[PDB]
Enzyme design. Structure first.
Site, short mmCIF file in Angstrom:
data_model
loop_
_atom_site.label_atom_id
_atom_site.label_comp_id
_atom_site.label_asym_id
_atom_site.label_seq_id
_atom_site.Cartn_x
_atom_site.Cartn_y
_atom_site.Cartn_z
CG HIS A 97 -2.21 -0.74 0.99
ND1 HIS A 97 -3.45 -0.12 0.96
CD2 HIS A 97 -2.45 -2.06 0.79
CE1 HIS A 97 -4.38 -1.03 0.75
NE2 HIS A 97 -3.80 -2.21 0.64
ZN LIG Z 1 -5.00 -5.65 3.17
#
Ligand SMILES: [Zn+2]
Ligand SMILES: [Zn+2]
Lengths: 53, 129, 382, 383
Positions: free
Chosen positions: D151
């Site tokens: 992320h």
């Molecule tokens: Zn995740």
């Protein structure tokens, strides 16, 4: 007379049917793929001789 | 404008050298499967049951390798030529980029006048014929 | 009997995958014929580069045939002519003008650097191909460096100095009972045909444009002489033949003769000047039509040697030779050109296929029917 | 129609095939805490490693320690200022770093904790060393459970992931491979790796995530790539409570098609533990055996593969599925008993090697699956 050199006003896109041919040529990508395929083909053998050593 | 020229020059030399490399691969492509098969058969766990078999397999591997060095050294040679030629071409290319980008000079202005004469001479070669 | 047969796409025969020995040398492409000369050995280098960049080397064993010696060349040629050929240089032609006018060298057979080396390498290529085909070590010998058939016993004409085809034929005849020869070149194989008129061992078939053309020989009545009667067939044609017409005039003749003659070995010339857009040619064949003959001959499962002659526009002969080499391995080609040194010379589309021209075909069906009628009538004698 | 539900076959592994696996574990990885009330918990790697030690899997697998990634190596993706601030920041001097933290999207949802650089460097080094050993061909599988945090953007640390070691691993694999296929299983969309490799052909960033109201807000069927990377961004958005059978029926066709068309040389398979039942934020209902069937199918091909960790906001289930996958990587099936360890009392009241699905509304109607498979096949045939 299309040989005339480009002017410094960036007439690159609207060019004399020749500049666009080279800037749009995807041959560099194919050359890169061929080189890297040769690299893989040689690296398999390299690992083989590394084990045998 | 030199960027265009070096972009044209790249593939020609690259392809000449790659054709040479393909020829070197061709002259020795029939021994790679044999070498790999010999190595894999040697590394088998059920192989050490006869000393003479070990000796003969080692002899075969040695003979194959003795035949295989020349192709490898020719490959080094052609790849070194590749590297130096490509180094020169990239040098020209990135000098061209740096010059073209530093200023968003009279010597390169003169070359336009020298080529303008050639363009003027070639244009009049059709009118005069 | 001639019947119209429409052309069909070529598909390989997976019945046989015989070994292919593509003889080649890297020094043949250096020699040049002149400045405005149409005959260029550079097309051999073009074809070899196309093969190399195409990925066809993994199947075929590439060799490098040893140049032939004078004694080997004396198997068919005369000592005096080969001596003059070896001695003549592009500098001392003034002292050799007597032989030049006597041996017909200089007008269509220009003297250039390494000319004797060129002849020696072509003769050695054919000789080594025949040697491989005779010992059982191979079944197809692509000797693209040869294809020199116009040369005669004591003369050199049509850019043809040393007749390597007859030398390879003699090598095959060392241990074979009967040998057969085929032609696809637009011209006529005068030297190869003449070399074996009086004997039954060799047959010489040529699909040659007739009339006011370069060789001017090889009519339908060239049956033979002496014991070699009915053993040299000829199929003269006219300008503008196409793929389907060539197939219909080619296949039945070969089928009939190999039914009758029953060859023990085969050699096939592969002249590339019989294509569309050719410089010195007058045909309209395409690469499919050109490869049809070699595929058909190979499909009969007989020891065959492919030689390479002709070809005066680089792209056409290069693509045709690459296609023939691929189809000799029972492999269809990609029909897209990979980038190489000569990528700029391969048209404006950079495609392997070359479109045949629209020009008007001249071969009338009844004329072809009569021609094959005489051919079959004279072949039925034996 | 392309999707076709099939019964879940039992686990089967080829006994003839032999696979080399180099497990990576840094003993200091599980000692940094994000905060008092933060879902992220690095302890799971340590518990999983303890499980693999206790199960006796060490006798059939190789395990090493990966040297921490240098700052220059870690900068192969992220900007210089981002890494500089990440190194310079401490939970005790953010008053003078407030503007930098605001710019870099850190502090509020992703807070600063001591040892942050150590954790980031450990994960990056694990990924880079796994890729390097993959290139050398010594080990067919390079398991790095520590990293997988996909992320992290180029200049922002969103979604509790400060450094994206998957990008560095893919880079070091690409240094010797032309095309590597990347597979995602995390519920959240892999925004970082996707954005990094959205304009390139040399990668296949295949994903299996869920589309709805979330933090990523990406992963549509429309996004396929720009430039030479067009149609090279395979996304399979899904919905609540996708069970084992339908997840397998979605995964196996797509992966088979990718391997038949894309033909990669190495696989960077994400194995996020937040796609399981009982997760803290993950809405899926996949069981552990369903979580491992994908890995077994990927392994069955016989190509080098780099397995990484990633998300997972629970500990026991994530550790259990990770050790089960590690066992399956060795062509060995792990029994349901969880042998005693220092952290045994964590593993629920069942004390069995299994995570069991819950009853959730299976919003994943077959029509949606057929439509998404048809779209994926249409955009994949162009490769
Ligand atoms: Zn995740
Ligand atoms: Zn000819």
């Amino acid at each position: 007379k299309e040989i005339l050199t480009p002017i410094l006003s960036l007439g690159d896109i609207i060019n004399h049917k020749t500049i666009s041919r080279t800037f749009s040529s995807p041959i560099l990508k194919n050359l890169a793929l061929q080189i890297i395929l040769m690299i893989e083909k040689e690296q398999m053998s390299v690992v083989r001789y590394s084990q045998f050593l | 404008n030199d960027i265009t020229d070096v972009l044209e020059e790249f593939p020609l030399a690259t392809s000449r050298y790659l054709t040479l490399l393909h020829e070197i691969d061709a002259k020795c492509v029939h021994s790679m499967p044999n070498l790999n098969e010999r190595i894999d058969k040697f590394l088998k766990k059920d192989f050490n049951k006869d000393h003479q078999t070990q000796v003969r397999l080692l002899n075969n591997i040695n003979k194959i390798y003795e035949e295989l060095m020349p192709s490898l050294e020719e490959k080094m040679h052609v790849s070194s030529i590749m590297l130096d030629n490509l180094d020169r071409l990239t040098s020209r290319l990135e000098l061209a980029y740096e010059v073209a980008i530093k200023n968003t000079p009279a010597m390169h202005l003169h070359h336009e006048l020298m080529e303008k004469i050639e363009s003027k001479s070639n244009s009049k070669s059709s009118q005069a014929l | 009997v001639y019947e119209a047969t429409p052309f069909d796409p070529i598909t390989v025969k997976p019945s046989d995958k015989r070994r292919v020995a593509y003889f080649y040398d890297a020094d043949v492409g250096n020699y040049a014929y002149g400045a405005g000369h149409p005959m260029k050995p550079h097309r051999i280098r073009m074809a070899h580069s196309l093969i190399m960049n195409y990925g066809l080397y993994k199947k075929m064993e590439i060799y490098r045939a040893k140049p032939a010696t004078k004694q080997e060349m004396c198997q068919f040629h005369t000592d005096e002519y080969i001596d003059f050929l070896s001695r003549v240089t592009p500098d001392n032609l003034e002292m050799f003008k007597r032989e030049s006018v006597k041996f017909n060298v200089g007008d269509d057979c220009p003297v250039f650097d390494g000319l004797y080396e060129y002849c020696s390498i072509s003769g050695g290529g054919s000789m080594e191909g025949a040697a491989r085909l005779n010992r059982g070590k191979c079944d197809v010998a692509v000797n693209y460096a040869g294809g020199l058939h116009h040369a005669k016993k004591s003369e050199a004409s049509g850019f043809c100095y040393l007749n390597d085809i007859v030398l390879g034929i003699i090598e095959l005849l060392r241990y074979h009972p009967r040998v057969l020869y085929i032609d696809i070149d637009v011209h006529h194989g005068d030297g190869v045909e003449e070399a074996f008129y009086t004997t039954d061992r060799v047959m010489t078939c040529s699909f040659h444009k007739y009339g006011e053309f370069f060789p001017g020989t090889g009519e339908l009545r060239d049956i033979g002489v002496g014991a070699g009667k009915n053993y040299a067939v000829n199929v003269p044609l006219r300008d503008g033949i196409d793929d389907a017409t060539y197939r219909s005039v080619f296949e039945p003749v070969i089928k009939k003769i190999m039914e009758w003659y029953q060859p023990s070995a085969v050699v096939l010339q592969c002249g590339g000047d019989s294509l569309s857009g050719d410089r010195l040619g007058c045909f309209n064949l395409s690469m499919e039509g050109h490869a049809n003959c070699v595929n058909y001959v190979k499909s009969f499962g007989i020891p065959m040697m492919v030689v390479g002659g002709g070809g005066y526009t680089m792209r056409n002969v290069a693509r045709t030779w690459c296609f023939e080499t691929g189809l000799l391995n029972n492999v269809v080609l990609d029909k897209d050109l990979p980038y190489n040194e000569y990528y700029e010379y391969y048209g404006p589309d950079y495609k392997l296929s070359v479109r045949p021209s629209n020009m008007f075909n001249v071969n009338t069906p009844e004329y072809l029917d009569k021609v094959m009628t005489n051919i079959f009538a004279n072949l039925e004698n034996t």
